[PDB]
Write a protein that binds this ligand. Sequence first.
Ligand SMILES: COc1cc(-c2c(C(=O)O)[nH]c3c([C@H](C)N4C[C@]5(C[C@@H](CN)C5)OC4=O)cccc23)cnc1O
Ligand SMILES: [Zn+2]
Ligand SMILES: [Zn+2]
Length: 232
Amino acid sequence: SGEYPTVNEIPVGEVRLYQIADGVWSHIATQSFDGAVYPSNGLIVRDGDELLLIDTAWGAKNTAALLAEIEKQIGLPVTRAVSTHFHDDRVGGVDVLRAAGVATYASPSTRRLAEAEGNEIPTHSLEGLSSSGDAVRFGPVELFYPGAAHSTDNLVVYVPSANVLYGGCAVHELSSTSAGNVADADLAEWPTSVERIQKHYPEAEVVIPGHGLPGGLDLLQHTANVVKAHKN
Ligand SMILES: COc1cc(-c2c(C(=O)O)[nH]c3c([C@H](C)N4C[C@]5(C[C@@H](CN)C5)OC4=O)cccc23)cnc1O
Ligand SMILES: [Zn+2]
Ligand SMILES: [Zn+2]
């Protein structure tokens, strides 16, 4: 009823959308992993009379539900999707998207890692993002590679029309007490990568983490704090 939806609020298999700004929504879904349930976010950005999708809803069935919820709530076609790193909460559902006529994209590093790890593989490579600090335009957003953090390949997304910063899993929510799933992380480099994000997007008004509640720019410093302390 208007609050940001939470993990106990969304059964696994259902998807909710949340209006962030004019023409910007997040999508929220839930999934089971190693015997625990987690929420996860993605982004939807209006692209004229089309939509750009950022990240799947963490699974084929969740991502089919995502497409159905978009048709219900927005009614514009999803034509392109970008996955911001190679894990299942970002690419699981890419096969569903591809069969629905969505063109799927990720960096070559993400595509290589997804293939090696047996995850679904976006079709198209996003060049121009292989060095930390790189940025490229993609429809109504800018894609930014901050350096290794939650994963070596993780990308962030900025919507300049609304000053919305989508940090993906390189950015944690304010209530976070841990650095999340650090299996593939670079804890030593993560603070440096967050500093690059902070320097590149100082006018961000909304910051959306890969999991949990959006907030403001404080999510970036909080993330650096939690990661440094996790390493401690
Ligand atoms: C520990 O508590 C939290 C965890 C998470 C969380 C995050 C995140 O932090 O982005 N990602 C997660 C993944 C994804 C699919 N996976 C799987 C994996 C393991 C490796 C294979 N060996 C690939 O690594 C990864 O990220 C699975 C379940 C939980 C998380 C978020 N909030 C929390 O509180
Ligand atoms: Zn991940
Ligand atoms: Zn994640």
